[PDB]
Design a binder for this molecule. Sequence first.
Ligand code: HEM
Ligand SMILES: [Mg+2]
Length: 90
Amino acid sequence: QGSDPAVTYYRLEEVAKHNTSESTWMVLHGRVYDLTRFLSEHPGGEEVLREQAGADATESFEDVGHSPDAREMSKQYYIGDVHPNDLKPK
Ligand code: HEM
Ligand SMILES: [Mg+2]
């Protein structure tokens, strides 16, 4: 019922738990990225990620205007999709 076996799903209330330097997950465009090993290598700094860790950071991501290389760089951190219950209705 909407459920691709190829896709692990994470509820947002779970993603919210990963908001620490020990484990930082973040949501971008309906997708969940584990950025823990990425923190120190993010050119915009750790702080800006930490401040939005455990949440949907899509808007902030897009407003900064990340580069194509930045988008390509994010893919290795993809660990699953946001549970459909927690996606916008429209
Ligand atoms: C939504 C949370 C995020 C925020 C708030 C954020 C914010 C920023 C800011 C403020 C800068 C500096 C502005 C500038 O370059 O002039 C920056 C640069 C950069 N960010 Fe992020 N970033 C986020 C997520 C990510 C992710 C997931 C990746 C990919 C793994 C990433 C990759 C980069 C790269 C490569 C740069 C260097 C410039 C470019 O290639 O765009 N960022 N980021
Ligand atoms: Mg490329």
